[PDB]
Amino acid sequence: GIQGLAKLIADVAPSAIRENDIKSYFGRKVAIDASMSIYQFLIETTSHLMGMFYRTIRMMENGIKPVYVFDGKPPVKVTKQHNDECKHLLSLMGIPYLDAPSEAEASCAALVKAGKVYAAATEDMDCLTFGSPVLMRHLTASEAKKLPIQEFHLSRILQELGLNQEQFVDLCILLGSDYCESIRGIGPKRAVDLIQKHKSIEEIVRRLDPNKYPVPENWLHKEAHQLFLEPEVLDPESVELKWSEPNEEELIKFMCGEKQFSEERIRSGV
């Protein structure tokens, strides 16, 4: 995640965010961060299946064509069983899924950048740092929250901030990422100003007062910078997204027979 990034974009580049009704995404393909979704559904339980079933029905009823992306090896805990059960449900629902080689959000970004889908759906702001042109938030949110879809357009973030993607990555590192430490005492607005002036963490560090703003020791900022700009992602040319007919009888055998959900409920959803 990126600490304070959504708040910063709302304060300093508000035209990069649009709040939209779910009906406005008719006909669009979306790459869902399935790993972040199942985690949210979990926050033997069946809420990973309840969430995946109902939020997927919601997307399809609004004309959205979702593809679910699952995490691979890393560069409340979601288990192999949760992922396997969700994939089994997705297959019987006729919804496509992809296994990312590493972070799902980086591979959802790759699908958007390649033009395979319109947007990446995740609450994780790392998706923008990994370079997704469009990020949609609150797509899988409970109807109890009645949240609009919060869409971020990365090009307008870069445009309002007067930055390229390399500089934006260094800004996110200074904001506080999960790949390395940030510099203590430099807040979000000061980090924007420093990057706009000096462009890189390298040019900032050679200027900071070591008495005032020392940098972390064994700082992995170069490795973090490289992972965001060149992430390990799925090859979008190997992807052909297809959606098929849900298998109602098998969905009943799995959700009702094996997982004890209501038959009338599952049948009405199918």
Ligand X SMILES: Cc1ccc2ccc([C@H](C)Oc3cn4c(c(O)c3=O)C(=O)N3CCOC[C@@H]3C4)cc2n1
Would strands 17-20 and 149-153 be described as parallel, antiparallel, or unpaired? antiparallel
Which is closer to Mg ion, CB of 35 or CB of 56?
A: 35
The nearest distance, CB 105 to ligand X, in angstroms, is: 5
The nearest distance, CB 63 to ligand X, in angstroms, is: 26
For residue 112, give every residue at least 6 positions away whose Cβ sits within 8 Å of its Cβ, in sequence order, or none.
Answer: 31, 118, 119, 120, 132, 133, 134
Contact 47/41 with Cβ under 8 angstroms?
yes
Is 105 among the residues that bind Mg ion (CB under 5 A)?
A: yes
Quick check: helix, strand or coil at residue 226?
helix
Quick check: helix, strand or coil at residue 187?
coil
Choose the binding region for ligand X from 17-25, 57-65, 119-127, 151-159 (rule: CB under 6 A). Answer: 119-127
Q: Which does 100 bind (CB under 5 to 8 A by kind): Mg ion, ligand X, none?
A: none
| Alpha helices, H only, 117-254 | 126-129, 154-161, 165-176, 188-198, 201-205, 221-229, 248-252
Considering only 31, 108, 126, 149, the residue that binds ligand X (CB under 6 A) is 126
Breaks in the chain after residues (C–N exceeding 2.5 Å) = 43, 75
Apex 129 CA angle, 51 and 136, nearest 5: 35
Is 78 among the residues that bind ligand X (CB under 6 A)?
A: yes
**Residues 27 to 86 in contact with Mg ion, rule: CB under 5 A:** none
Considering only 85, 105, 151, 170, the residue that binds ligand X (CB under 6 A) is 105
Per-residue mark of binding to ligand X, 14-43 (x: CB under 6 A): ---------------------xx--xx--x
Would strands 149-153 and 134-137 be described as parallel, antiparallel, or unpaired? antiparallel
Is 178 among the annotated ligand-binding positions? Answer: yes
Residue nearest to ligand X (CB): 1
Considering only 8, 66, 103, 119, the residue that binds ligand X (CB under 6 A) is 103
Which is closer to ligand X, CB of 1 or CB of 94?
A: 1
CB-based burial, 140-173: b 16+ in 10 Å, e otherwise: bbeeeeeeebbbbbbebbbeebebeeebbbbbbb
The nearest distance, CB 175 to ligand X, in angstroms, is: 12
Is 124 among the residues that bind Mg ion (CB under 5 A)?
A: yes
Contact 119/13 with Cβ under 8 angstroms?
no
The residues of the shown chain that bind Mg ion, judged by CB under 5 A, are 103, 105, 124, 126
Residues at the binding site are: 33, 55, 71, 103, 105, 124, 126, 176, 178
List of residues contacting ligand X (CB under 6 A)? 1, 35-36, 39-40, 43, 71, 78, 103, 105, 123-124, 126, 178
Residues at the annotated binding site for Mg(2+)? 33, 71, 103, 105, 124, 126, 178
